[PDB]
């Protein structure tokens, strides 16, 4: 049973293949990348079928991680850097001064290099991303059990794809899956960096106090 | 003297804004909180003379302390509880279930209790609030100086008032300025609580990345 054919999934990754053209810099890629993030989700087989109530949670729940994998996978193609969907490849010195220096290394050592070391590919990337998207532990789903069943369906095809393409090594599947913990952890840390900066510098609570309209000292 | 910045006036502002699962309640109150601050602030002498731009910074800048300053004073009638503008009273037990036990405990000892200890009053409380408002260390002030001057005016009046009303407490003026550090501290503490809860944000966080 090759339901959730790796073929479709590969197709999906390329669809968002990016047309040849600080934190803030990354501050622009995700949201523009809702575009990518949304188109990408649509194509996962069986994905749209979910009650849209649920579908929405997955997108919001996945997202940081779904984004990170992408800059991570793209950078394998490069040496000593990360390159965004805004184009824009970044370097250590800047990243460090910008303060995401800590976050930045973990990505290279724990995410890219390992991705590169195993010579990871787009089909594998897509299935890994797909696995994140169908996240059961996500909060608010009407049919959680529903999501779990589909997820299993994703990796299972995943295991198989790996077998044909890379026969010599039978541990590759487990190897791909072990990158997820690293991917998840990197996602949390980003959040940690994001809050501190808001907290660290002035007039925080601007965002928590929702949108600014004090102009009405007028009324 | 009192001409440059008059308390009677400062008193009028306070009297004017007096109201006629706490974490949950405070948040709802946000639209309303806006009215009180801006409304109160406008009655402060010389505040309206400042560039509209500066006024925004100050309000947003001191939004937390001003409210806090306000809810603590009210609480004095109340025993071992906090009184919100909502009129809601919060208590330790209730508060501790909600995780803000740390902050709640400080407001009373550090703030509410001491205020009652000195029988703080509305003119003085109002004066302390204004000093907080006219904060010149606020980033972006078009001109910080206007603010330093305006702030200086409030203490003169405040100092002078304390003497007329309280000759027997040479102590009072300084004592009041001394609650400013406690007041500032509680605010950042609140901010810390506000962020942690968003972050150990059950369900979805980063929900907040609204364009």
């Amino acid at each position: 049973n090759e339901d959730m054919p790796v073929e479709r999934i590969l197709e999906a990754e390329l669809a968002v293949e990016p047309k040849t053209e600080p934190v803030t810099n990354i501050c622009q890629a995700a949201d523009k990348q809702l575009f990518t993030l949304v188109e990408w989700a649509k194509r996962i087989p069986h994905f749209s079928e979910l009650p849209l109530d649920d579908q929405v949670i997955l997108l919001r729940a996945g997202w940081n991680e779904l984004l990170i994998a992408s800059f991570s996978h793209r950078s394998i193609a490069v040496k000593d850097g990360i390159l965004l969907a805004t184009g824009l490849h970044v370097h250590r010195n800047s990243a460090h001064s910008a303060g995401v220096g800590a976050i930045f290394d973990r990505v290279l050592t724990e995410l890219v290099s390992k991705m590169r070391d195993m010579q990871m590919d787009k089909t594998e990337l897509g299935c890994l991303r797909a696995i994140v998207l169908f996240n059961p532990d996500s909060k608010g789903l009407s049919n959680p059990a529903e999501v779990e069943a589909l997820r299993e369906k994703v990796y299972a095809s995943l295991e198989a794809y790996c077998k044909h393409k890379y026969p010599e090594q039978p541990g590759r599947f487990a190897k791909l899956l072990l990158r997820l913990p690293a991917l998840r952890s990197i996602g949390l840390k980003c959040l940690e960096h994001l809050f501190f900066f808001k907290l660290i510098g002035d007039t925080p609570i601007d965002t928590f106090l929702m949108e600014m309209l004090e102009a009405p000292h007028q009324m | 003297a009192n001409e440059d910045m008059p308390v009677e006036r400062i008193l009028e502002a306070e009297l004017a804004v007096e109201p006629k699962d706490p974490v949950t309640n405070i948040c709802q109150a946000a639209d309303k909180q806006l009215f009180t601050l801006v409304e109160w602030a406008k009655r402060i002498p010389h505040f309206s003379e400042l560039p509209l731009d500066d006024q925004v910074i100050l309000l947003r800048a001191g939004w937390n302390e001003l409210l806090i300053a306000s809810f603590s004073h009210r609480s004095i009638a109340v025993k071992d509880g906090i009184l919100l503008a909502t009129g809601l009273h919060v208590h330790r037990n209730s508060a501790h279930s909600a995780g803000v036990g740390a902050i709640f405990d400080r407001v009373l000892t550090e703030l509410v209790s001491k205020m009652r200890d000195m029988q703080m009053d509305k003119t003085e409380l109002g004066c302390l609030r204004a000093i907080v408002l006219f904060n010149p260390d606020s980033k972006g002030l078009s001109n910080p100086a206007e603010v330093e001057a305006l702030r200086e005016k409030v203490y003169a009046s405040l100092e002078a008032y304390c003497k007329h009303k309280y000759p027997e407490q040479p102590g009072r003026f300084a004592k009041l300025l001394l609650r400013l550090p406690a007041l500032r501290s509680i605010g950042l503490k609140c901010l810390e609580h506000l962020f942690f809860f968003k972050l150990i944000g059950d369900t979805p966080i980063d929900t907040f990345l609204m364009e």
């Binding site: 809702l34 649509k42 849209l52 929405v56 997108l59 | 609204m210």
Partner: peptide, 9 residues
Amino acid sequence: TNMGLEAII
């Protein structure tokens, strides 16, 4: 809160 999302989907 955020239904900008529901939009594109």
